[PDB]
Swiss-Prot record, chains A, B:
Its EC number is 6.3.1.5. Deamido-NAD(+) binds at residues 32, 137, 170, 177, 223, 257-258. Transmembrane segments: none annotated. The keyword Nucleotide-binding applies. It comes from Bacillus subtilis (strain 168). ATP binds at residues 44-51, 78, 84, 157, 186, 208. GO terms for biological process: NAD biosynthetic process; sporulation resulting in formation of a cellular spore. This is NH(3)-dependent NAD(+) synthetase. Homodimer. It comes from the Bacteria. One of its GO terms (cellular component) is cytoplasm. Pathway: Cofactor biosynthesis; NAD(+) biosynthesis; NAD(+) from deamido-NAD(+) (ammonia route): step 1/1. Induction: By heat shock, salt stress, oxidative stress, glucose limitation and oxygen limitation. It catalyses: deamido-NAD(+) + NH4(+) + ATP = AMP + diphosphate + NAD(+) + H(+).
Length: 271, 271
């Protein structure tokens, strides 16, 4: 079935061993950064589940590399656009993660300069939806600047429940070097974060991209019209309604371009 | 050989028919539009060879879609960082391409905001090289904002002679939706421009990324330490000197990450 194909493409297991998934994903981070010769990792810490989880895995990987006599560091970076409404949850995430370094880059001045230029050149106001993707891409630029300056790889937080819906900005938070959370459903991520000892406030925090000025902290599920638990059931191979399977198989086909390198006439996936 | 392998991977011919190449690449643009229900394209026009060629192909594609009773448009966009030294060549390119719409977005104020913020937050000035990658990624954001506002796809200008060296910014000019130039060597791109009747200045000038404030209009070959004739000979299957194969095969391996989606533990290419 199409559910099985998608499950397999996205690397989703029906059941997991949380402790061994943590070990395997820490080990992937160590293997990849050692293979490449990079000095460690950078990651934007939003206060949300996925970056809290990826951040803690990164910090565990660099601690293990130093325990072996290697040189590795993790830079966590706060990337508010001006005042972030849930700053307290991001600060809670930093207290849990205990990153080597805690940096901050406020993207508001960059985003405002871009938006103001846009209206100057075109005569058109940049709309809230397009400005939200500007913010996500400006966060990518900030993380790659830190990484370029410091010799680090940029972590991404994509996982199967965001992959299957294409619920990320293309070349924004989709732009990253390596992905420790690939294959995890939303609830499986949550299980890892709880096993790592995070408080409920972090592992049960409502998912949000928080990109819009007109509707700050808008829930992902409001935008999707589908819950993460339904997504997660689909991806783990449980039975879902026809409405759920139909809507997710259409969104998956519609967003394949975000899960492939740019299309050329030699590619067969878009045909 | 690894030469033959890289030729296959990058889709390169030793031998092409220029009229057929143009037909195929225009037909790809039209097919991708028809399949996806897309409304046209946006592309940064630099005054260099590659964006000249991709831009004229895009304009031929949208003219053919409209001749067939469809709806499509092409927005060409100038993306100077303040005063661009070869603005005249970009204007010559626009005059040849004859785009439906020619827009402009000066990226300087955005890049200066970002760079001033970086130094305020970190106490470090961005290297000229890191700031040049900020410029390339800001150009990606500009094209995606125009595309997002207007309902268009973003063209990229990657081709085999840039792909083999990884000579593009990751999620900068590498970040695009579809690629009309895939598989072309540099001299093959020149041959297609000659068939389309381009002004010779645009294919005789030196290739340049022109990203650096301190070394403006730096030639690609100065940065690479290898010429386009050498790259093209390699890619076209011609017997080359061992020094060229050594240099290119090392760059190709080192930059594989730029030609794959972000790495996960379920990928083996990187190990
Ligand atoms: Mg997320
Ligand atoms: Mg979030
Ligand atoms: Mg080029
Ligand atoms: Mg150029």
């Amino acid at each position: 079935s199409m559910q099985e194909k998608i499950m397999r493409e996205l690397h989703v297991k029906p059941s997991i061993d949380p402790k061994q998934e943590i070990e395997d994903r820490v080990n992937f981070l160590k293997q990849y950064v050692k293979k490449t010769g990079a000095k460690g990792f950078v990651l934007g810490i939003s206060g949300g589940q996925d970056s809290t989880l990826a951040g803690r895995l990164a910090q565990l990987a660099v601690e293990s590399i130093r325990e072996e006599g290697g040189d590795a560091q993790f830079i966590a970076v706060r990337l508010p656009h001006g005042t972030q409404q849930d700053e307290d949850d991001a600060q809670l995430a930093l207290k849990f993660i205990k990153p080597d370094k805690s940096w901050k880059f406020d993207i508001k001045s960059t985003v405002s300069a871009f938006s103001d230029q846009y209206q100057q050149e075109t005569g058109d106001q940049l709309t809230d939806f397009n400005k939200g993707n500007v913010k996500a891409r400006t966060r990518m630029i900030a993380q790659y600047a830190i990484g370029g300056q410091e010799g680090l790889l940029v972590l991404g937080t994509d996982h199967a429940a965001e992959a299957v819906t294409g619920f990320f900005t293309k070349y924004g938070d989709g732009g990253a070097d390596l992905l420790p959370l690939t294959g995890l459903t939303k609830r499986q991520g949550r299980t890892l974060l709880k096993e790592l000892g995070a408080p409920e406030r972090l592992y049960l925090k409502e998912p949000t991209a928080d990109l819009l000025d007109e509707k700050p902290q808008q829930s992902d599920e409001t935008e999707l019209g589908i819950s993460y638990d339904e997504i997660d059931d689909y991806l783990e191979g449980k039975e879902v309604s026809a409405k759920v399977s139909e809507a997710l198989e259409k969104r998956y086909s519609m967003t394949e371009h975000k899960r492939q390198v740019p299309a050329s006439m030699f590619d067969d996936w878009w045909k």
